[PDB]
Design an enzyme around this catalytic site. Sequence first.
Site, PDB file in Angstrom:
ATOM      1  N   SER A   3       0.873  -1.198   0.000  1.00 50.35           N
ATOM      2  CA  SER A   3       0.000   0.000   0.000  1.00 50.35           C
ATOM      3  C   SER A   3       0.906   1.242   0.000  1.00 50.35           C
ATOM      4  O   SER A   3       1.764   1.322  -0.897  1.00 50.35           O
ATOM      5  CB  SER A   3      -0.958  -0.071   1.166  1.00 50.35           C
ATOM      6  OG  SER A   3      -1.938   0.947   1.096  1.00 50.35           O
TER       7      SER A   3
ATOM      8  N   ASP B 244      -7.916   1.474  -8.474  1.00 53.16           N
ATOM      9  CA  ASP B 244      -7.435   1.953  -7.150  1.00 53.16           C
ATOM     10  C   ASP B 244      -7.957   3.378  -6.920  1.00 53.16           C
ATOM     11  O   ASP B 244      -7.749   4.245  -7.803  1.00 53.16           O
ATOM     12  CB  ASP B 244      -5.910   1.842  -7.060  1.00 53.16           C
ATOM     13  CG  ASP B 244      -5.339   2.060  -5.669  1.00 53.16           C
ATOM     14  OD1 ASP B 244      -6.043   2.646  -4.820  1.00 53.16           O
ATOM     15  OD2 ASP B 244      -4.185   1.640  -5.445  1.00 53.16           O
TER      16      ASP B 244
ATOM     17  N   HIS C 285      -7.649  -0.970  -4.892  1.00 53.85           N
ATOM     18  CA  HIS C 285      -6.333  -0.893  -4.206  1.00 53.85           C
ATOM     19  C   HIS C 285      -5.784  -2.310  -3.991  1.00 53.85           C
ATOM     20  O   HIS C 285      -6.528  -3.154  -3.446  1.00 53.85           O
ATOM     21  CB  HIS C 285      -6.493  -0.108  -2.902  1.00 53.85           C
ATOM     22  CG  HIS C 285      -5.218   0.161  -2.178  1.00 53.85           C
ATOM     23  ND1 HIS C 285      -4.167   0.824  -2.765  1.00 53.85           N
ATOM     24  CD2 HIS C 285      -4.854  -0.080  -0.902  1.00 53.85           C
ATOM     25  CE1 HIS C 285      -3.196   0.963  -1.886  1.00 53.85           C
ATOM     26  NE2 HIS C 285      -3.586   0.406  -0.739  1.00 53.85           N
TER      27      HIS C 285
END
Length: 414
Positions: free
Chosen positions: A256, A350, A378
């Site tokens: 991330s 995302d 994501h």
Amino acid sequence: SATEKYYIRDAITKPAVHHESYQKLWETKWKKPCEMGVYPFMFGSIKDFEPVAQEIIKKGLKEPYDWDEYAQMYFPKAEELAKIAEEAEAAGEKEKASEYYLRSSAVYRISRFPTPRSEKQKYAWRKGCEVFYKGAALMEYPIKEVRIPHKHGIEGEGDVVPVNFLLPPNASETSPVPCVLIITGLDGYRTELAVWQQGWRSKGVATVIAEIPGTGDSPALRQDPTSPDRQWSSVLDWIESQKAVDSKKIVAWGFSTGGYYALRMAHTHKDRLLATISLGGGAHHMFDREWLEHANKLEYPFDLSNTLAYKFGYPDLESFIEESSKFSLLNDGTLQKPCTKVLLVNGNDDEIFPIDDMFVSLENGQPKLARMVKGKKHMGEPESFSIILEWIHKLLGLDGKIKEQLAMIPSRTK
């Protein structure tokens, strides 16, 4: 025009239902991964979170959250689980003790999501780490905290980089092992991505897990774009001092927000890394006014843009946006530098960091490996995990049993 600027177009203006209430966050987003024992509920049980969620839903908590009010809702369950762990450990029931300490750690964790911004959330971070390491110490192959001296630190930086460390039992200077350096994200810290370490141990791979600046126990200056560079110099120096680890086989995997740092250090620490992976990372457009002024209302469970601003050491979103351009790997010249092997993976859709940042990464400097995941947001899970494990296995010449490695991630609890 945000709808013109980014790959996802008008998706950026559609507010996600989970922002309406905690009830919608639970029903539409969190109940499912909690049932499956996966991020953000690694080491966790539906049996623990279900009754907490019911009490929060009854109160009708919603944005804007009072983080002290929110965090307190989780403490009774966290304390209950720690008590069961303590009694288990006293009776010599090590497996039960380990499970319940780790279940306690998961409840404390969610209480300080998205990032500790209140006294009770900072308390939950400390309490969560305490019970995490009590549980980790009781694993068959204990995961331990190493407080790495931050020798590369400057004025105002902490003196240690606290990391998780797991060395495979057969590791020695005779048979030295590769190391996967896991760089954590905006909300998942070393107590979360810990879930990957036993899987890597099983493949004969050491793991070090470190937090990004302005998260967990990172000693790095929040507002200084070069602060991660010093942190990784300190971490990699320490890994080099562990002779059971092959210094020529360090792979940095950024999860991330961690993906930004993985991509960055492929350039800043090229000569010290075999490869880096950015999974759901960004590089440039993640710092745009237009992206940040929309992202608070999208797929992130809470207020992504405000959370990112806090992590970068700004007291509000506007103060961050005023200066955010300086963190861009394009603007600061990082992406023009030579890099070690880089794999970029993300979902096209995302709404946390734009896929447009994968394009910026592919528009600059040396060619990089990429896998886009169509129709996924994501991280582009779960196919992203298989893509990356397959690549790391080929890179390090591992046994290729990646499906089995991934099957180890979901939490089992009683």
